[PDB]
Amino acid sequence: GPLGSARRLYVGNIPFGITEEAMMDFFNAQMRLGGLTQAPGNPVLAVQINQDKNFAFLEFRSVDETTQAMAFDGIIFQGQSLKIRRPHDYQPLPGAHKLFIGGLPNYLNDDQVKELLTSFGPLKAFNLVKDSATGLSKGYAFCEYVDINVTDQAIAGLNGMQLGDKKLLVQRAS
Amino acid sequence: GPLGSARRLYVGNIPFGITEEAMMDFFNAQMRLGGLTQAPGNPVLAVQINQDKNFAFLEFRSVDETTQAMAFDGIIFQGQSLKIRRPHDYQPLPGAHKLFIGGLPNYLNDDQVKELLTSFGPLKAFNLVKDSATGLSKGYAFCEYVDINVTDQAIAGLNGMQLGDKKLLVQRAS
């Protein structure tokens, strides 16, 4: 989800011919050799490879273990020195591009509000706040966009928008 | 209640991804460092998290320690300011926070006097003391606020203040 990119690493300079399973076994082995796991089992859940551009992505079962694996930068695999880095969309500070949406008309439902937000692009997370004892909107919501670079384009567009009877507040929830 | 919800607090603005364990350790640690604990061992018994709406409820082992832990309202936890409140279900006992208002001009009626008090927030009780046979005010009133945290704000905003050629008195009724 949001934390998805806190559970992945980029791996460059991979050796010719190597398969996804062989990479998986190698990294699991190294994590156990160095005592870097936080529970029994295998930290790496999956591996995707681009053979043509000689790179792969690793996906881990946890955030703490993903961080630990960073210490393997420069490690040797079938003769070659691997390059380990964070994804370009890694969020050092999590939830920093989460938005608060305030001053919505109380009659508007989940999908209607979503439809206002998604004109700037797709969402990874969305919730509208309601009274559970009635089902009625309290008039605010929260969201995060798939592509965090769209965030500021959406604030510029929506903050202050006249929605019939009311004026929207749209800002980073912080 | 009247006696319900004595050992639970609402915690708003929790960081996403955080565990029930990590939140438990944090609050148990703070109670000790802050000197709020009243006995050996752990004041916090359990935590329940809604990951999607970023809030939790803590259950404490004792009534007084739940009360003490309200002083943490605003504390920073992994970059986020925590919002600590009583549950909506919690209500203090009848008249716990009754207020006396003296020095009102006696030509003023109930609604006129009530208007000054409801500027601070809504009332669950009010009575302007009147001479029964005639009907005209004695110049003092009693009231009680729905939100009991308003009580202290009313006092600070009205006590010792000028109203005509009279200075108001606003204090707890007992």
Concatenated DSSP letters of A23-52: HHHHHHHHHHHTT--SSSS-SEEEEEEETT
Contacts of A129 in chain B (CB under 8 A): 53
Buried b (16+ CB within 10 A) or exposed e, B56-73: bebebeeeebbebbeebe
Across the A/B interface, how many CB contacts are shorter than 8 Å?
14
* CA gap A115, A94 in Å, rounded: 25
Fold of B1-93: Alpha-Beta Plaits (3.30.70)
For chain B, give the number of residues. Answer: 174
Residues 57-116 of B with CB under 8 A from A: 79
* Closest residue, chain A, to B17 (C-alpha): A3
Torsion of CA B151, B157, B162, B167, to 10 degrees: 30
Nearest CA-CA distance, residue B16 and chain A, Å = 7
* Closest residue, chain B, to A94 (C-alpha): B16
* Closest residue, chain B, to A128 (C-alpha): B53
Instruction: Please list, in sequence order, all residues whose beta carbon lies within 8 angstroms of the beta carbon of residue A29, skipping any fewer than 6 positions away.
Output: none
CB-CB contact of A59 with A8 (8 Å): yes
Closest CA to B49 of B13, B79, B81, B92: B13
* CA gap B84, B60 in Å, rounded: 14
Find out whether the peptide bond into B2 is cis, omega within 30 degrees of 0: yes
Instruction: Please list, in sequence order, all residues whose beta carbon lies within 8 angstroms of the beta carbon of residue B45, skipping any fewer than 6 positions away.
Output: B59, B60, B61
Helix or strand (DSSP H, E) at B69: none
* CA gap B44, A21 in Å, rounded: 45
Q: Are A95 and B15 an interchain contact pair (Cβ–Cβ within 8 Å)?
A: yes
* CA gap A84, A61 in Å, rounded: 17
Nearest CA-CA distance, residue B100 and chain A, Å = 35
Q: Which of B17, B53, B79 sits opposite A3 (nearest CB)?
A: B17
Residue A173 token pair: 């929830």
Q: Where in chain A is the domain with CATH 3.30.70.330?
A: 1-92+149-174, 93-148
Closest CA to A97 of A172, A169, A5, A154: A172
Fold of A93-148: Alpha-Beta Plaits (3.30.70)
Residues 37-66 of B with CB under 8 A from A: 52-53
AA letter at A124: K
CATH superfamily label, A1-92+149-174: RRM (RNA recognition motif) domain (3.30.70.330)
CB-CB contact of A103 with A168 (8 Å): yes
CB-CB contact of B16 with B54 (8 Å): yes
Nearest CA-CA distance, residue A15 and chain B, Å = 35
Q: Are A95 and B53 an interchain contact pair (Cβ–Cβ within 8 Å)?
A: no
* CA gap B85, A153 in Å, rounded: 35
Resolution of the entry in angstroms: 2.5
- DSSP label at A90? -
Residues 5-44 of B with CB under 8 A from A: 15-17
CB-CB contact of B168 with B101 (8 Å): yes
Residue A130 token pair: 């309601």
Q: Which of B16, B52, B53 sits opposite A95 (nearest CB)?
A: B16
* CA gap A115, A133 in Å, rounded: 26
* CA gap A38, A35 in Å, rounded: 8
Contacts of B15 in chain A (CB under 8 A): 94-95
Helix or strand (DSSP H, E) at B112: helix B110-117
DSSP helix, strand, coil percent of chain A (3-state; round to 5): 30, 30, 40
H helix intervals, chain A: 20-33, 63-69, 110-117, 151-158
Q: Where in chain B is the domain with CATH 3.30.70.330?
A: 1-93, 94-174
Nearest CA-CA distance, residue B22 and chain A, Å = 13
* CA gap B117, A3 in Å, rounded: 48
Instruction: Please list, in sequence order, all residues whose beta carbon lies within 8 angstroms of the beta carbon of residue B22, skipping any fewer than 6 positions away.
Output: none
CB atoms within 10 A of CB B101: 24
Kindly indicate whether the domain formed by B94-174 is annotated with CATH number 3.30.70.330: yes
CB-CB contact of A43 with A37 (8 Å): yes
Contacts of A95 in chain B (CB under 8 A): 15-16
Instruction: Please list, in sequence order, all residues whose beta carbon lies within 8 angstroms of the beta carbon of residue A144, skipping any fewer than 6 positions away.
Output: A2, A95, A97, A98, A99, A123, A124, A125, A126
CB-CB contact of A31 with A173 (8 Å): no
Cross-strand partners of A169:
A102
How many whole angstroms from its chain centre is CA B72?
Answer: 14
How many whole angstroms from its chain centre is CA A172?
Answer: 17
- Technique employed here was X-ray
Q: Are A94 and B52 an interchain contact pair (Cβ–Cβ within 8 Å)?
A: no
Q: What is the CA radius of gyration of chain B?
A: 21
